[PDB]
Amino acid sequence: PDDRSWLEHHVVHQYWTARPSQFPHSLHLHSNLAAVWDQHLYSSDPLYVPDDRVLVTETQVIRETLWLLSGVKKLFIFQLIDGKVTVRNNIIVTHLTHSCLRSVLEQIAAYGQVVFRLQETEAPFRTYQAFMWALYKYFISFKEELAEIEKCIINNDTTITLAIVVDKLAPRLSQLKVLHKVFSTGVAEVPPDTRNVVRASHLLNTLYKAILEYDNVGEASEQTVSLLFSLWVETVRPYLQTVDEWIVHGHLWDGAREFIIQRNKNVPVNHRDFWYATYTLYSVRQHTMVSFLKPVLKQIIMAGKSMQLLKNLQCAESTTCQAGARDAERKSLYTLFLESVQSRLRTPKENLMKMQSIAESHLELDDVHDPLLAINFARMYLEQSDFHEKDVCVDRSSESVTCQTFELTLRSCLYPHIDKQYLD
Amino acid sequence: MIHELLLALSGYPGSIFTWNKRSGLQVSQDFPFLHPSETSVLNRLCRLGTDYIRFTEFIEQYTGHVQQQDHHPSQQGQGGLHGIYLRAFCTGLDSVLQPYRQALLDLEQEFLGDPHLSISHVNYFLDQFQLLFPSVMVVVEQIKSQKIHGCQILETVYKHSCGGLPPVRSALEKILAVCHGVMYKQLSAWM
Amino acid sequence: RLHQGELQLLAGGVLQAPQPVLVKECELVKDVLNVLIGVVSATFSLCQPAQAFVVKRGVHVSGASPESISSLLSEVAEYGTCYTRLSHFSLQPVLDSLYSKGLVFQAFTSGLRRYLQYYRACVLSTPPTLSLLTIGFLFKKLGRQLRYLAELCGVGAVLPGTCGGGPRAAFPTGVKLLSYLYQEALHNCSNEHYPVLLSLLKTSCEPYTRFIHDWVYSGVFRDAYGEFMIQVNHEYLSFRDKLYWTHGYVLISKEVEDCVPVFLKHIAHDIYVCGKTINLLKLCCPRHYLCWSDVPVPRISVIFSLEELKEIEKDCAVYVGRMERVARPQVQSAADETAVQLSELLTLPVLMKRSITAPLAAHI
Amino acid sequence: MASSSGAGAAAAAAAANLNAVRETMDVLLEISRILNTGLDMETLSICVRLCEQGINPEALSSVIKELRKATEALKAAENMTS
Amino acid sequence: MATPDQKSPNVLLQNLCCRILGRSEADVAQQFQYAVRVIGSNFAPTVERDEFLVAEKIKKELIRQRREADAALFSELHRKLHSQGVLKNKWSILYLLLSLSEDPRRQPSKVSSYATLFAQ
């Protein structure tokens, strides 16, 4: 334990352990502000009983703050009680007053609580899966910066203060606040008993309204506008895929019944109501109209009905199943939309030869290479070794003045291609 | 420890990260030298490692044994996972873990380059596989639990192909392509 | 070290944990390379009856726990054990007069020697600068394939005395070898071993296909180990009656599945009748113009390249026409890819059928 | 040639017993945590070794309480001197 | 087979004191003497020497502390420990653990600095 204790003294103190790590600090008034404040309090009120306060390092506080912001649960200073991140009451820093440190940590804890609520997302449905994917991408982007901050802290070469870290995270903190509000409105405000279709429609409408708000907010929301655009693109990807499948195959494949149109299985194509009853909009509540598709929703419905008819009419093998552009080779509505958006925004045997060379370098001249064995060994060793087989930048910040309105951008990049396919 | 952690993720359980046939890879105990938040991060990484270990165990269970030439191949499908499609499934799983192995090797190289790196860098770098592996593990567990047999497993994979994770979608497409290659081989023989 | 001390304190001295010996990795790599050649090292000792490396207790590696490092090294030692034991099983060298496994088995062992040579070449190609985990992953597939093939061939690395597995069946020979190869190819058709197994099957059939060729063209029974379905009874070959034809050359009919290759079963009877007829004609009228033609008989061989197969078919047709007038790739290169194009296009049984029966049917 | 194989199996059995002991110790640590005993890994291991030696739990409890009071006074002095 | 030098209970107690105080063995000499005095004192037999009875008492005490989940967890852990059979004195360890249990609900009576006067 002695060698281990020496390391433990030199590898960073057990202060994170409930064992009180006493650390040497400068007694200068500017450096001993906590101790001087304790002395003043002790001097001023004869009723003041000194509470047990834990002395934490500023670097240690920063590291724990980054870990909280990294989404770590069960922090020592910030405790999670009923899903609320709460600061332990007995924590003090040398350079801060207990009340001031508590206030700053309370702001940080509020943001952490927001993250924690956002961190708990399971993704049970296609739309929720897309929202989770976008959230994961956002959290990845945040974790990158967090890791860079942690690396700079680890290097310990430069004085990093809590203020410096807060300022560095300020743009990210603003983006996080906007995301928290948008997420709360889009998901948290959705009643739990709402139908998956209804939940999806409410989320989609919330996304559209948020998009309008951030587009009207101008340049200052550029990072937020980009985030929202990525969220919208991701959320439409499954919806656009379902629309594409209905248009191309004439079959509405909707396992969760999240699309605004439901097919009545009871209406066969030869049924008189096939044209009218086979595909029903989930119209029971007028709220089921998809706002982003709403300008084109009627054309979409007509196209889907027509494609369902053609695929549902026993068409003779129509040559217009051209072997040319496969629907799999057709750019998906998500893919076509992303490509059109980027283009308008200007936005973003050989193995056998290798095995033969390896054999010549390592096999004796006289041993005939067995081509079945040569291929097998290539795949198992050389192709195993050489397996170094290791995005729509919808950021309006570049040409925000030239970027179309979210609705205008949608109409110009997505709706024209959909209308073309519908017409065809 | 980082090398030890990767070894646990590489299938070498140690004293800190114990592999349990029932519990999988787990942090053995609270150690006095780590902050409880570091313990939580370690437990999340051990969750990912446990899933990887379970995947490797499944791969060995259904692919790791030489095929007994029992005269009746049809009965192998009942008790044990068997069939050419089962071999293709195991091969696909190993191929999907190949990129994970490559990423682990890159992590190893980085840790060799910088001894001061912390677990947060790994958690950042490995998060993509922390999202990929749970979904494929769920799909495999569903296949095992439902005793999906022959090409009917392919239908389940298609059902699983409808997942929301783009990387999981691509991986399941690769696996489905391998299984369809085998199916096409059988179909070619028949036709 | 702290954690191990804590564990020892908890274990109250009863768990005599082997002392962790810290070794430099730049050494562990050497031991790994030796294992890849089946060589015992300072940390891994070779258990002779198992032909297996045994890890020295208490191996510590810097940056990893000695128990986890020991686990990794145990897996690597298992791979090295498989390599060395498989080499020893395949190392049965000389078809000496005591060799009872036959020429098909000897050819199989020659193909296995070629495979092990390729494996050795790969091991030597492994740069010593690679990481232990990188090396382990790179050789993981190859070791799995080697273990699978060793179990498939019954030449599994397990020491015969300690593995309570029932008596390892003798490696099949002749028709039994062909049927075993066909069954293993069917069972391993999805594995990385399928092309190697096809190559080995071809190589083992090569002596058997030569025996078939000699039997069909000259009526000569070349089965030294009794693997061929036809036996020659010289006592009845001197007879000049029906008994010469019925008893001089006898196709082993009762165990047709064991005496005739499973892939040749559909043509085995015709081959037997052809060889019997050729031997009868040689015995009764050796100077018959059909019987005395010096016309070269077309080669009977297994072909796995579609281009080579078409070329063989054309050459066979030309040979047949020339002989009638007179009477009156697979696995052999490296970079070559057509050699296996048929093997990927066609199934091993269908490929073998097309490759073998066409020359067989032509000669019959 | 046979003998070399046995030592590996014996070592594996010993390692399995040790791993089982480690698992049991982890279970005991978890139980102590649930019981809010306040023992750390080193302290818990020391306590386990002492308990294996037969110490009376009442005497041990009184000693622990007195040691905890002394440790708290020493920790307060160390935190005041830093 | 040289059973690891399990230092005599006095040395083990000294190491434990050093670990608990976070001071070297030389700094805990008075505490070591106090420990020796306590250990040499006759202690009454534990109230319960039955592993299952001790587990049930622990569960009841946890329930009295309104920790029913902790009582169930304790009973399960006790069953597992009894089945593992690694510990020779299950009753003694259970009694120790019971004696060391702390009620999270009872606000720690902050030990008046005055207690240090008797420590000297």
Please report residues of E whose CB lies closer than 8 A to that of A19: 22
Cα first-last separation, chain B? 57
- Which of D5, D15, D21 minimises the CB distance to C11? D21
Q: Is C118 on the interface with A (CB under 8 A)?
A: yes
Please report residues of D whose CB lies closer than 8 A to that of E77: 27, 30-31, 34
Cβ pair D75:A55 closer than 8 A: no
Q: How far apart are CA B31 and CA D41, in angstroms?
A: 6
- Residue ranges with strand state E in chain B: 17-20, 24-27
Q: Which uninterrupted H or E stretch holds E72? A: helix E68-84
Cβ pair D21:C54 closer than 8 A: no
- 8 Å CB contact between B92 and C190: no
Q: How far apart are CA A1 and CA D48, in angstroms?
A: 17
Residue type for position A24: P
Q: Subunits touching B (CB < 8 Å, at least 3 pairs)?
A: A, C, D
Give the distance, in angstroms, between the CA of residue B45 and the centroid of all CA atoms in the same chain.
14
Q: Which tokens go with E51?
A: 């592993």
**Chain C residue with minimal CA distance to A3?**
C2
Interface of D with A in 52-81 (CB under 8 A): 75-76, 78-79, 81
**Interface test mutation site (partner D, options A7, A22, A91, max chain D beta carbons within 10 A):** A22
Residue type for position C41: S
Q: Is C2 on the interface with E (CB under 8 A)?
A: no
Q: How far apart are CA A241 and CA B141, in angstroms?
A: 27
Q: Residues C57, D9, C75, B134: is their CA dihedral positive or negative?
A: negative
- Which of D24, D42, D57 minimises the CB distance to E46? D57
Cβ pair C190:B91 closer than 8 A: yes
Q: What is the CA radius of gyration of chain B?
A: 19
Spell out the alpha helix ranges (H) of A70-217.
98-119, 126-155, 162-183, 196-217
- 8 Å CB contact between A1 and C5: yes
Q: Which tokens go with B106?
A: 């890159």
Cβ pair C138:A384 closer than 8 A: yes
Q: Is C10 on the interface with D (CB under 8 A)?
A: yes
Which backbone phi and psi does B28 adopt, to 5 degrees? -70, -45
Q: Is D53 on the interface with E (CB under 8 A)?
A: yes
SS3 content of chain B, % helix, strand, coil (to 5): 70, 5, 25
Cβ pair E46:D78 closer than 8 A: no
Q: How many other CB atoms are there within 10 angstroms of residue B149's CB atom?
A: 16
- Which of B17, B31, B84 minimises the CB distance to C190? B84
Cβ pair A371:C114 closer than 8 A: no
Please report residues of D whose CB lies closer than 8 A to that of E96: 47, 51, 55, 57, 60-61
- Which three-class secondary structure state does DSSP give residue E11? helix
The DSSP secondary-structure symbol of A281 reads E
- 8 Å CB contact between A342 and A249: no
Q: How far apart are CA C41 and CA C33, in angstroms?
A: 10
**Chain A residue with minimal CA distance to D78?**
A22
How was this model experimentally determined? cryo-EM
Query: Quick one: resolution in A?
Result: 4.7
Q: Tell me the pairing of strands C52-55 and C44-47.
A: antiparallel
Please report residues of C whose CB lies closer than 8 A to that of D45: 6-7, 9-10
Q: How far apart are CA A72 and CA B119, in angstroms?
A: 12
Which H, E and C letters describe C262-315, residue by residue? Answer: HHHHHHHHHHHHHHHHHHHHHHHCCCCHHHHCCCCCCCCCCCCCHHHHHHHHHH
Token pair 């562990």 in the structure block, residue: C28
**Chain B residue with minimal CA distance to A145?**
B124
Q: How far apart are CA C111 and CA C118, in angstroms?
A: 11
**Interface test mutation site (partner C, options A3, A357, A360, A375, max chain C beta carbons within 10 A):** A375
- 8 Å CB contact between C289 and C348: no
Please report residues of D whose CB lies closer than 8 A to that of B31: 41
Q: Is A52 on the interface with E (CB under 8 A)?
A: yes
- Which of D15, D18, D41 minimises the CB distance to C11? D18
SS3 content of chain A, % helix, strand, coil (to 5): 60, 5, 35
- Angular region, C174: left φ>0, alpha ψ -120 to 50, beta rest: left
Q: How far apart are CA D49 and CA B113, in angstroms?
A: 41
The DSSP secondary-structure symbol of A158 reads S
Which H, E and C letters describe chain D, residue by residue? Answer: CCHHHHHHHHHHHHHHHHHHHHHHHHHHHHHHHHCCCCCCHHHHHHHHHHHHCCCCHHHHHHHHHHHHHHHHHHHHHHHHHC
Helix axes E9-21, E29-40, angle to 10 degrees: 130
Q: Which tokens go with C279?
A: 């031997």
Q: Is E53 on the interface with D (CB under 8 A)?
A: no
Cβ pair D33:B18 closer than 8 A: no
Q: Is C114 on the interface with A (CB under 8 A)?
A: yes
Any residues with CB less than 8 A from the CB of B172 and at least 6 apart, and which? B136, B139, B157, B160, B161, B163
CA distances for A227 relative to A179, A223, B113, C207, angstroms: 8, 6, 34, 70
Please report residues of C whose CB lies closer than 8 A to that of E3: 13-14
The DSSP secondary-structure symbol of A80 reads E
- Which of D52, D64, D73 minimises the CB distance to E89? D52
- Which of A72, A132, A143 minimises the CB distance to B41? A72
Q: How far apart are CA C254 and CA C252, in angstroms?
A: 6
**Interface test mutation site (partner E, options C9, C10, C15, C19, max chain E beta carbons within 10 A):** C9
Q: What is the CA radius of gyration of chain E?
A: 18
Q: What is the CA radius of gyration of chain C?
A: 27
**Chain B residue with minimal CA distance to A65?**
B37
The number of helix segments (H) and strand segments (E) in chain E equals 6, 0
Q: What is the CA radius of gyration of chain D?
A: 20
B84-122 b/e (C-beta count within 10 Å ≥ 16 → b): bbbbbbbbbbbebbebbbbebbebbeebeeeeebbbbbb
